[PDB]
Each structure stands twice: as structure tokens, then as C-alpha cells.
């Protein structure tokens, strides 16, 4: 581990515990998902993006300038975590494309982190040769570089470093006659340098991921890594943390106002459907019941609420008892865990059991068409421009970010200060707004 | 007081009960550490040079261990018996054709003569199973986990009937050399735990063995485990005031200091019943740090089981009570016609493995990959040591002579230990020339 950035082409050969193995896998999955969501929400170059992702790195300790702390733990964490993601992600072309997008975002940000003094030794450590030119050479060949340069306006050849490269390394660059050539050597600004290195890095990663895809069947024989490595990205929440066992004071009568002021669109419309129908299908019923369990409602409050609502449902109260009260108590109590003991996370809500005719569960952004999304947004009184970028985000299949933007719009705020993954987190933050 | 009061009032103190070999005098002694004494572990990639690695089992590679052992034994017996070709267990042929597979019990209890099944290797019979019938078979001797070559008639496919069985030829004896003939006569101490009574910590039998050794001056001494057994009531109730490793180190240092004057070589065989050590058969040796240079030159530790050579004579050491384990479910057509001990030793020599029984009894813990790569007999041993809770005995079968040293302590009742002369006889002449001379089983 000689430098912070590193190109990942030498797999580690150390020995680590299972707990550290899972910690690295989950931490790097969280980092890449955060990179995806932040890059979707913001522009890739803004200081807000830079500082927010720096804070994400600091809370996940994945990169920093060399010191006593950096040498042992963080860069090694980066190494093994990246390779276990290689194993997780080499399954499919779609996952490979996703991983490549996020790792290019990560590597470009990290390169922007590195100060200009250390980029020379980084390229030297990169094992592929590139020679920076001297100031005298730059001054002598400035006119040639400007004359042969791309549409960059003016003669200004600023502080940006210029390197010497074999011509075969920049084929697509020079083949447009937008660079000067000297004895088979090119001279290039920093933006095109990083473009070249990222293209080469994507080529090497594509080949390596294909090779690991050829190596998956042998390495999947293990039983303690199959159920994880099948689903690091597909169906794992990034520490949603809205686990059962929370506390709070909720008044049963206030449920309507709390639904219209603090519920994510899916749960809001589910509660309205319950109020207007006094009956739900299995999926929506279980979803809303365990959500109400999560928000802090106690067992007696939940039972009384559901019984009262089925009073308007017109079935026998003893039938209610025998049929459902067992199910609600089981959800609040004993095992059957991870399906009835837990509050549903957003990634689960979107990927599991899409609603059908007569169903109202499921995230509406992913499970209903844009015209009905627009109708619902009009019914919820959001500005037409806000609805416009909501639909733009829906076209970009970033449903969680769309829900985020809906949250700031309904709360009349700018940034929620997080990235939502759990409806109970949505509700907790809305209560934090008071 | 009343702890070990039998050992303070044992009439048979020093008396010898049984003997094998030649009528020999009683002044049993050795030349001390002086003289050329060889001591080398042998066979099956060197019986855990390192400590050990794992407790993670994979059912697939356990299966490949099983089928590999079955295939190896099948190939060896096919080449030795000039067999035409084996047949799949599910392929019915009317003419008597040979089969192959390891013996198992149909249910989960103790083996019964009519509750036995046959399951073969996958390359012959897809690893399937089939019940066997022994009513037609005249003589046999079966126990779970042994390879057999049953040329039974299977005209139906769903059940075979035994016609005649093939005994398994044992491994050839380890071929000696001239330097082996260049050894003079030597005698060995053997002793197995427990070294204290059921209600003591004093280790009076241990002191008695120290006295016996420093009075007799033997060549090499053998001490089997357990040293601090878990089944002891004083430890199972766990009233001890000192750590298990502390007590164990105290014990080892007591034996070491008690045999400084002996000069005889020393080695300890760990046992599954030992509490502080890893309960995984086969086991790594013990762990100890405080040794001087002469201590290292005089004391060793070996894995359990171990195949070690002394003066070019093969010693096969196993601590587990394999005799008792086999005797529980081994079956034969006749019981009183031959010796149960004789047939059990027949099986242990035949199956080429230090533990031929599968599945083992509850009070063991076998990791099968390590068992296959570390617990195979390299050769038919010259002499075997099997400390067993059953009665002490010494027999010789198929050239291999076996001594049961007995238990040094049976609760509070008197125990036994054994002495054996070994000496390489004339290099040629008779085809079989056992290094052993004579053995005494002498009560402690």
C-alpha cells in the first residue's frame, strides 16, 4: 500500500476474520451507494458534493493523506473491500456497469483530493510511464500546444501540468488532430490526462471483472459467503437502523394528521386507502401494521386502532380477534423474525411484491405510472416545477432521491440532511422537524 | 488417608500378572541414556508437524474423504485378490459377482447382525446404499466403517445376500536395514492415565511411577493421557482452585523432574479425555515451554495417533479406547470360538487406519480430512500400544504383537503397567523375525 489512490490490480493474500470481512463488504457497499445517490442528487463538481462525500469517507474511513493512521488500516480496508465487491458485482453486465459508474465517480473525486505535488509520485507508483515536462519546455512549446490544442479559448497556458506520453496511449485523443506531436510524444492538459487514465482503468476493470466472472463458480462453493455475496447490492439496506425496539409517545387520534404531515407518499396513500376502505390486502396490511409498530405505537394501541377501524369494516369483533389479533401479537412478539419482527426498509418495499389491482402498497414512484404520479402530486399540492424534477428523477429510476425531494418540498425546506432508505427514518426526521 | 488407601495397602505392589514371549528373570532394567537409541516419527505426512488448523467441516469433502478411502482399499484388494471387475450395487446380475462398499448400521443404534447395510464408492455404485443379509454367510466379522469385498449374489438389486467374504490383506511390514540389526536389546516403559484416584489430586500413582522409573532405569518411557481427565468427578464438579493448564503444567513438570536421574527417553501421548487440550481426534501434541537443552534431547511429544520408530522397530500408539469402541458393535458368527480381542486387532491391522470405525461413538470428535491425511498406518506396525479400559492382555496376530498396558488407575482399585524387551533378531533365516522378545504386565 504505497499511496492513497492505488489502482486495483493485485488481489490481497492476507487472512482476515469473518466479522472484519462482512464489515468491509457492508461499509464499501454503503460508500458506493452513497456515491451513487449523491452524484444523482447534486452536480459532480460542487463544494457541497465534495464536502458531503468527504464527511461520508471520514465516517467510513476509506481514504486520507498518508500519516501513521493511513498506512495500516484504511487503504487495506479499501483494497479488500474493493476486491470483495469485485466478487459480488462480477455476476452481471448491468451490475458491472453500475459498479464502473460509481467507481469512476469515486476515483475522480479521490484524484481531485490528491494535491498537485503528489500526483507525480502517484503516476510513478502507477507503474505505467508518464513524463511531466519542464517549465522551460512548457514555455518553448506553449505556442505549438495552443495552436494544436482543442477549442480551449485563448493562448492562456496556465498552471495546469503538461506531461509527455507515447502516441499509442492517446489514440482517440490525437486521431482528431487536437494535440501536438513531437517525435511520437504528446503533450496534454490535466483534464485530458485524467480522462485517459479513467478510460484505461475502465478497460482494465472490464477485463478483470470478466475474468472474475469466469472465476465465480469455483469460489462460490463456500457456505458462509454465498448468502452475502449474492446480495451485497441487490437487497441489502445501508444500515437503515430503524429496527424494532424504538420508543416514543404517539396519540391514536393524531394518526390522520400525522399521516398527512409526516408520512412518505407510499405510506400516506396506504393510510388514506385504509381510511377510505377500512380493509387492506395482505401486503399493504402487513406493511402498514409493522410500520405502525416501528414508529413507536404500543401493542394495545395498535390492537385498539385496528379493531376500531374494522368496526367500520363490518365484520364480527370476535372474528377480528381470532383471525388477526394472533397475527398482530406474533408480529409484535416472538420469532418468525426478519419478516414480521422488522419494519420494512425502502429498498425492500421497491424490490419485493409489486402491487396489483386492488393493492396500494409498494413505492408509488416505482409501482405506478407517471400520469398517476402527477395526479397524486397535484392532490398533495406540490409546485409544478418541483413535480417536474420529481418526474425527471423518476425517469432516472432514482426513486429514493425522488422521495427525498418530495420530503423537502412538503416540508418547505432545501435539504433534508441525509439519504432516506426507511419509511420509519422518514417519519423520524419529519418528527425532528416538529 | 482414605484417598488412594488401596494404593497404600495394595498387596500386589510390584507383582507381575501375565507374560508373553520367553521366560525371563525379574531384574528388568536398561542401560540408561547411554547407547544408540533411535526415535523417529514415521508415515502419513509426519503426523501433525504443526499444531492444527480448523474446526470447519464440509459435508462434500468429508464425502470425498470417505469415497477416496473406499476406492483406495478397493483397488488394493482387487490387485491382491486378482478380481475380474466390480459391479454397481444397483445392477442386478444372477451370477455371483463381486461388490464393494463400507459397512454401516441401518438404524442409529447398536449394530445387529441383521441390521447392516452396504454402501459403495461413487465410481462403482453412485454412492448408493443396500441392506445386506448374513444368514447364508458362514463366517464373518463386521463393524461399521470398514471396507469389505462381498462377492454376494444380487439377482434383484434392492437387497443382497452374503455368500462369502474376502479378508483384507494387511500392509507389508516395514523392511529393516543393517543399522537396525546394529541395535542391542532394549526395553520400554508404557503407562496410561488416569494417574490419580477418583478423589485425589496428590497423584500417588504418578509418584509410584516416578519411583519405578528411577529405580529401574529403562530405555524409553511412554505416558498416555488423559492427564487431567474431564470425566473425573472432582473436575466435572469443577471445585479446582487452579487453572486446567496450570495443573497440567504442574503435572508435566513433576514427571520431568522425577525422571532426571532416570536418563531414559520420554514422550507423552495426548488423549481425547484430556480436558485442556483440543478434543479433536487426531490430536496435536501437548504444549510446553520450560525445557533445558538436555530436556529437549530427552523428552518428546507426539501426535495422537502416532507412528514412531524406536531402534528401527515400529511403534503404533493410539490413546483412544478403540478396543472398547469396536467391542460394542463388532459382530461375528462365533463368539467363543476365537478371541474378541484377537479379531478386533485383526480389524485394526487390516483396515490400514488408526481408526477404522465409522461412525464413531459419541465420546469422540473426528475431523475427517485430518483423519485421512494424518491417521493412516504407513506400515503394519511391529508392535502396537492400545491402552483400553478392558482387561489387560498381550497377543500377537499377523506378525504384529499387541500389548494392552491396562489402566494405571481404575477409580481407587489397583492398576497395571507393562515392560517389553525389543531386539532386532538375525537379519536373515526365518522369514518372519519380530524385534520383540518378551513382555510383562506388572501391577502398580
Amino acid at each position: 500500500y504505497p499511496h492513497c489512490l492505488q489502482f486495483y490490480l493485485q488481489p490481497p493474500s492476507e487472512n482476515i476474520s469473518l466479522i472484519e470481512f462482512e464489515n468491509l463488504a457492508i461499509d464499501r457497499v454503503k460508500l458506493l451507494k452513497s456515491v451513487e445517490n449523491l452524484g444523482v442528487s447534486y452536480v459532480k463538481g460542487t463544494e457541497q458534493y465534495q464536502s458531503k462525500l468527504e464527511s461520508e469517507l471520514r465516517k467510513l474511513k476509506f481514504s486520507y493523506r498518508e500519516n501513521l493512521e493511513d498506512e495500516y488500516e484504511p487503504r487495506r480496508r479499501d483494497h479488500i473491500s474493493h476486491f470483495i465487491l469485485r466478487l459480488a458485482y462480477c455476476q452481471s453486465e448491468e451490475l458491472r456497469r453500475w459498479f464502473i459508474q460509481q467507481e469512476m465517480d469515486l476515483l475522480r473525486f479521490r484524484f481531485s483530493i490528491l494535491p498537485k505535488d503528489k500526483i507525480q509520485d502517484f503516476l510513478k507508483d502507477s507503474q505505467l510511464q508518464f513524463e511531466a515536462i519542464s517549465d522551460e519546455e512548457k514555455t518553448l512549446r506553449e505556442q505549438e500546444i495552443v495552436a494544436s490544442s482543442p477549442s480551449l479559448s485563448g493562448l492562456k497556458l496556465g498552471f495546469e501540468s503538461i506531461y509527455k506520453i507515447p502516441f499509442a496511449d492517446a489514440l482517440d485523443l490525437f486521431r482528431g488532430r487536437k494535440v501536438y506531436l513531437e517525435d511520437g510524444f504528446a503533450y496534454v492538459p490535466l483534464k485530458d490526462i485524467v480522462a485517459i487514465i479513467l478510460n484505461e482503468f475502465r478497460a482494465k476493470l472490464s477485463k478483470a471483472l470478466a475474468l472474475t466472472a469466469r472465476s465465480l463458480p469455483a469460489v462460490q462453493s463456500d457456505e458462509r459467503l454465498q448468502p452475502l455475496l449474492n446480495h451485497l447490492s441487490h437487497s441489502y439496506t445501508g444500515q437503515d437502523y430503524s429496527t424494532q425496539g424504538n420508543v416514543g409517545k404517539i396519540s391514536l387520534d393524531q394518526i390522520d394528521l400525522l399521516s398527512t404531515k409526516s408520512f412518505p407518499p407510499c405510506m400516506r396513500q396506504l393510510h388514506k386507502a385504509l381510511r377510505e376502505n377500512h380493509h387492506l390486502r395482505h401486503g399493504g396490511r402487513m406493511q402498514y401494521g409493522l410500520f405502525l409498530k416501528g414508529i413507536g405505537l404500543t401493542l394495545e394501541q395498535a390492537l385498539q386502532f385496528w379493531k376500531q377501524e374494522f368496526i367500520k369494516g363490518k365484520m364480527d369483533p370476535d372474528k377480528f380477534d381470532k383471525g388477526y389479533s394472533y397475527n398482530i401479537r406474533h408480529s409484535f412478539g416472538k420469532e418468525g423474525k426478519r419478516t414480521d419482527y422488522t419494519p420494512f426498509s425502502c429498498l425492500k418495499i421497491i424490490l419485493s411484491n409489486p402491487p396489483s389491482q386492488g393493492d396500494y402498497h409498494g413505492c408509488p414512484f416505482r409501482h405506478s405510472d407517471p400520469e398517476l404520479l402527477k395526479q397524486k402530486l397535484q392532490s398533495y399540492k406540490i409546485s409544478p416545477g418541483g413535480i417536474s424534477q420529481i418526474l425527471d428523477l423518476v425517469k432516472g429510476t432514482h426513486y429514493q432521491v425522488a422521495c427525498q425531494k418530495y420530503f423537502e418540498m412538503i416540508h418547505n425546506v432545501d435539504d433534508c440532511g441525509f439519504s432516506l432508505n426507511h419509511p420509519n427514518q422518514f417519519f423520524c426526521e419529519s418528527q425532528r422537524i416538529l | 488417608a482414605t484417598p488412594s488407601q488401596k494404593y497404600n495397602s495394595r498387596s500386589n505392589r510390584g507383582e507381575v500378572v501375565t507374560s508373553f514371549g520367553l521366560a525371563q528373570g525379574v531384574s528388568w532394567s536398561g542401560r540408561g541414556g547411554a547407547g544408540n537409541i533411535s526415535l523417529k516419527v514415521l508415515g502419513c505426512p509426519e503426523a501433525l508437524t504443526g499444531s492444527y488448523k480448523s474446526m470447519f467441516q464440509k459435508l462434500p469433502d468429508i464425502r470425498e474423504v470417505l469415497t477416496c478411502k473406499i476406492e483406495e482399499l478397493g483397488s488394493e484388494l482387487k490387485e491382491h485378490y486378482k478380481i475380474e471387475a466390480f459391479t454397481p450395487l444397483l445392477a442386478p446380475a444372477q451370477e455371483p459377482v463381486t461388490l464393494l462398499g463400507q459397512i454401516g448400521c441401518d438404524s442409529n443404534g447398536k449394530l445387529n447382525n441383521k441390521s447392516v447395510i452396504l454402501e459403495g464408492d461413487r465410481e462403482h455404485s453412485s454412492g448408493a446404499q443396500i441392506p445386506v443379509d448374513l444368514s447364508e454367510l458362514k463366517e464373518y466379522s463386521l463393524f461399521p466403517g470398514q471396507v469389505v469385498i462381498m462377492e454376494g449374489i444380487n439377482t434383484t438389486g434392492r437387497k443382497l445376500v452374503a455368500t462369502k467374504l474376502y479378508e483384507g490383506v494387511p500392509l507389508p511390514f516395514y523392511q529393516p536395514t543393517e543399522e537396525d540389526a546394529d541395535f542391542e536389546q532394549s526395553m520400554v516403559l508404557v503407562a496410561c492415565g488416569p494417574y490419580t484416584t477418583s478423589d485425589s489430586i496428590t497423584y500417588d500413582p504418578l509418584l509410584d511411577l516416578i519411583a519405578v522409573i528411577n529405580h529401574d532405569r529403562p530405555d524409553v518411557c511412554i505416558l498416555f493421557g488423559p492427564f487431567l481427565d474431564a470425566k473425573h468427578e472432582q473436575v466435572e464438579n469443577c471445585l479446582l482452585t487452579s487453572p486446567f493448564e496450570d495443573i497440567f503444567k504442574q503435572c508435566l513438570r513433576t514427571i520431568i523432574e522425577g525422571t532426571r536421574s532416570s536418563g531414559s527417553h520420554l514422550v507423552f501421548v495426548p488423549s481425547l479425555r484430556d480436558v485442556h487440550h483440543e478434543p479433536v481426534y487426531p490430536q496435536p501434541p501437548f504444549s510446553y515451554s520450560d525445557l533445558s537443552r538436555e530436556d529437549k534431547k530427552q523428552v518428546q511429544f507426539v501426535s495422537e495417533p502416532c507412528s514412531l520408530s524406536i531402534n528401527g522397530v515400529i511403534f503404533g500408539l493410539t490413546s483412544t479406547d478403540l478396543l472398547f469402541h469396536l467391542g460394542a458393535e463388532e459382530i461375528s458368527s462365533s463368539s467363543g470360538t476365537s478371541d474378541r480381542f484377537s479379531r478386533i486387532l485383526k480389524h485394526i491391522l487390516t483396515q490400514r487406519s488408526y481408526y477404522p470405525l465409522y461412525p464413531p461413538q459419541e465420546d469422540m470428535a473426528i475431523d475427517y480430512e485430518s483423519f485421512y491425511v494424518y491417521a493412516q498406518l504407513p506400515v503394519t506396525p511391529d508392535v502396537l500400544i492400545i491402552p483400553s479400559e478392558l482387561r489387560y492382555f498381550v497377543k500377537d496376530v499377523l506378525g504384529c504383537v499387541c500389548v494392552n498396558p491396562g489402566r494405571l488407575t481404575k477409580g481407587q482399585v489397583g492398576g497395571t503397567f507393562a515392560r517389553l524387551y525389543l531386539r532386532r533378531p538375525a537379519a536373515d533365516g526365518a522369514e518372519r523375525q519380530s524385534p520383540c522378545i518378551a513382555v510383562q504386565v506388572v501391577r502398580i
Binding site: 488481489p11 493474500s13 466479522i19 462482512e22 394472533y326 426498509s345 419485493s352 | 441390521s115 454402501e119 454412492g127
Partner: protein, 419 residues
Amino acid sequence: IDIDGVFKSLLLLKKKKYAALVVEPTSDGNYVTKQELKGLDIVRRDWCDLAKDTGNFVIGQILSDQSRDTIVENIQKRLIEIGENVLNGSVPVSQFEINKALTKDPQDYPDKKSLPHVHVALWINSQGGRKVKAGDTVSYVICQDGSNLTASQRAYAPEQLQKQDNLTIDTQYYLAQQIHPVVARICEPIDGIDAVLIATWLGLDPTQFRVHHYHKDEENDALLGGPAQLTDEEKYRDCERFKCPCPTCGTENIYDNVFDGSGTDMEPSLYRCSNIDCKASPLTFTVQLSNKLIMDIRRFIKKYYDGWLICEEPTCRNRTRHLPLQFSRTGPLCPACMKATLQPEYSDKSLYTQLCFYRYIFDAECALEKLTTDHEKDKLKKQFFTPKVLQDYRKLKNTAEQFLSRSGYSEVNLSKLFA
């Protein structure tokens, strides 16, 4: 690519083992709801006729065209009347009978103590006349004798039971292993339904039934957005607690947490013995606490290496140790169920979990990183956490850490994964 068939409703259970309403599109867009399914077969004939009737009712209700909620409500109500009828004894006695054949003679079975039908054969051959020969079918029923024996050790004959008023039948044993498996085999895969929930539906079982209940099929990575890595209180909730009698007073001591109490008095359990009258701190007896730890982790290692195998078809649940040489796609085929897959009773990772649970019990250093309020951390550590007691706790840690270091791929090597 092409279409091969239509199923109006399908119960996905296993490869070539499912229930599915076959739909053959007829003329004018109509279809016939043909009834076909794979894998419903049963291997052992030792079920009550009322149990078979209940299973047929379950399959009929799960194969009706109506909605999931309607089917669930019908099955739950019917299961409730079945449970109440069995509990109050209104069910006629003849339906409780169990039939079973005899492969061998009664004494020949090595598991005579565990097989109730061979036990009944022993009883009849002893007390009566005509012996039970191999190839004959024994008829018997379970009974409750008040002798706290195992159910298998209490099976009687129907006529003998009807002639005996002293001892009665065991509704608990039926609701445990004669009705619950038959229904649960089909009704369990339906989402939002678990064997614990059926137990609550049918009777007073839940607690003792989770005690005597298999939690192997419950695990499945089909959670499409559920767990990430869990927390301790649900990781170790299946791990057995730590036992130790107090040398001073002979009182049992319970430990499943580094600390003990609620809030201000959240002192470690080792500070005070569970006995209120005991005045000696367990902190003195670190030697024999470590000895007990060595002993019971030794017992757990022995239990795992025992290599006990269980058939995962809930009806069979064959308990055996001989790993069969036959081996299917998923694992070792059941020698009794020619279509099944075995797996250990005590998982290797289950033992890993329990040993990590022990190191969690004794890892005061990590437990000091979970209470957020640093002021409380400081006052508690100054009032009780001396360096001597921390060294004792660290010794307790190492007592299990020196097994965990060599423990069964609790560490993973990267070379064979990246080769």
C-alpha cells in the same frame, strides 16, 4: 423462446416440487382449471387418519381459486376448531390411531428405545399371546402416563388405552409432532405465516414449541431488502446462556450480558451473585469460571463434531449420524426420504455464533462502547471498573479467544478466493 404453460395460482416450494393450478387455454379464450402438482407425496405412513384429513383440507383450501387472505382466514379458523376439538377431547378416539409396519422383529431394531411402534411390539409380545412377526402391521396410539417419560416410551395399544382409565392421551404430543408438521409443510411457505404462528393458532404450545422447534428452514436469503448485519440481541437470541453454580451458596448464576440492571444501576453481573444472601463477589472465582467455560465450550465442540443430520422435509425429520455416500445437488440425500436434503442439527456457524456469544458475554471492553452517555461511562468505570477486574475480564475473554483463533474458518483466507 416460447410459452409452455399457464398456472392460475402456484405454490412455489422446490425444484419439481410445487403446487400449481394448471391452466389449459380452450376455445374462445376459456380454460380448464386442471389440478396437478409435484412433490406432494408422503414417504412414511405413520400419520393419524385425522392428520391426513387435515392435510387434504389444507391442500384443497390452498388450491382454491379464492384470494390469499380468504385462504388464510379459512385455514386459520379450521385449524382453530381442530386444535380446540383435540384439546377438549371431542374428537372420536379411533381417529387418533397410528399404523406402522414391521421391517424386522421388535428386538431386532437397534433404536427400540426410540421407536414407539417397536416399543408397542415389545409390550404386546411380552404381555400377550400372538407375537409380532416381521411383515405385520402394528396399530397403536400415544398416551400420557404421568411418568414424565418420553412420548415414544409411552405408546400404547388402542384397546389397552380404552381399557385403561388411569392414563390418558397426549394432546401436546399430537399438536407438536402429528398435526403441526402435516399442516406446516404446506401452510408455512405462505408469506406472513410461521410455524410459531401455527402453534399459537392451534394450542398453548408457543414457548415450549419454540424450545422443541426446528429453526433451520426459517433462514433464507430471499429477503429482498431486509437484513444488513443485525445486532447482538437478535444474533445471540438462539444461543444457549451461560450457567455456573456459585461455590459459596450453591446458587445458579445466569449471564447473557456484560452488564446487568437498568440505567444508573447497570453494574456487571459478576459484581454480585444472583443470590441476594450471597455476600462473596464472583470476581474472586475467575479460575473455576474459566474452568466451567472451558468445560461447556468443550461440550459444544463435541456436540458439533457428533455430526447429527436431520432431514429437512418436515414430515420425515430423520435423525441420523451416518453421512450417506449418496449425494444430491444441494447436499446429502436422505436415506429415508429419497427426495430430500440433510443438514446438521447443530450448524458449524451456529457453534461459531455461540462462541462469539461467549466472547460477547465477557467482552467488557466492547460493551463499554455501546452506552452512549460518556458521563455514565466515566462514573461507572471509576466506581467499579478497576484495572484488576478488567484484567480478570480479559482473561475470561482469552479463555474463548484461544479457541476462536483456531476456530473453523472464523477467519477467511483471501488467496484461495482470489486464485
